[PDB]
Design a protein around this motif. Sequence first.
Motif, PDB file in Angstrom:
ATOM      1  N   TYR A  69       0.806  -1.213   0.000  1.00  0.00           N
ATOM      2  CA  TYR A  69       0.000   0.000   0.000  1.00  0.00           C
ATOM      3  C   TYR A  69       0.840   1.263   0.000  1.00  0.00           C
ATOM      4  O   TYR A  69       0.370   2.304  -0.468  1.00  0.00           O
ATOM      5  N   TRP A 115      -4.263   1.024  -3.412  1.00  0.00           N
ATOM      6  CA  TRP A 115      -4.742  -0.282  -2.983  1.00  0.00           C
ATOM      7  C   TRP A 115      -5.354  -1.009  -4.174  1.00  0.00           C
ATOM      8  O   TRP A 115      -6.340  -0.543  -4.754  1.00  0.00           O
ATOM      9  N   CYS A 140      -9.296  -4.637   2.387  1.00  0.00           N
ATOM     10  CA  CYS A 140      -9.157  -3.346   3.053  1.00  0.00           C
ATOM     11  C   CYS A 140      -9.843  -3.354   4.412  1.00  0.00           C
ATOM     12  O   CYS A 140      -9.241  -2.989   5.421  1.00  0.00           O
TER      13      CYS A 140
END
Length: 296
Positions: free
Chosen positions: A69, A76, A83
């Motif tokens: 990230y 992402w 997430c």
Amino acid sequence: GCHVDSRVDHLFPPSLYIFVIGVGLPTNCLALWAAYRQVQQRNELGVYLMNLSIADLLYICTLPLWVDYFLHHDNWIHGPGSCKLFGFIFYTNIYISIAFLCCISVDRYLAVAHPLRFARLRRVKTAVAVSSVVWATELGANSAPLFHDELFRDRYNHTFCFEKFPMGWVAWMNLYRVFVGFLFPWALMLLSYRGILRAVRGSVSTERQEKAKIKRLALSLIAIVLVCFAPYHVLLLSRSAIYLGRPWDCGFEERVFSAYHSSLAFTSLNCVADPILYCLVNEGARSDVAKALHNL
């Protein structure tokens, strides 16, 4: 909103997380082993040590994705559910750790300052009960972001995860974070170690060198927690005091990625501080770890 970037944001958090992985993985595993040995000896402390190690190990396994990230300038490409789960673990494990340090601190106060008393509170069963209670309370109080938007996709080469610049609900989440996940547990830790030192003062059996050693250890514990966690919460209280301050009149690009992300990375050093401070400095735990490495 308003776009932000930092060049060092790309560099420092990834290398710091590489060192955190490569060091705190085996050290937390060894600390977990020593904690289990303590649990086998009817010791109320190892069960807390067990959770602490566990709380760090999960965090460590969360870190690789944030590495990807970071080195992609906050991009992402791994999905919304990843997430949600990984950001929840990443942002919540540090408060779980702080809570377990508080529990350890209180157990030490009760053992040293008030011996001959509170035997019921110093059992393994009571420690399991309080460990379940802290896991439930921390995982449930911090599960507020799980019931809101997962990520944001501002088209300045960013793709975000569990953060939106600018940032309703997240403000009061931040206020609760700072005041009841840092200041309260840290206040309890400090008060309990001050109680321990005052009790140690009157120990006839303890010679002067050992009292100084205990004072250095206790101050080191408090100081290392504060130095690891203070920058992140200071910046977070400042940013949440401006989003509930002048609203939608915020230029904080000079202090968004640099401050925030460098400070989160620097907060990750607590996962490597705990195995050293609570296992590897004590002689008996090192004896147990040496026995473990004699086998292999």
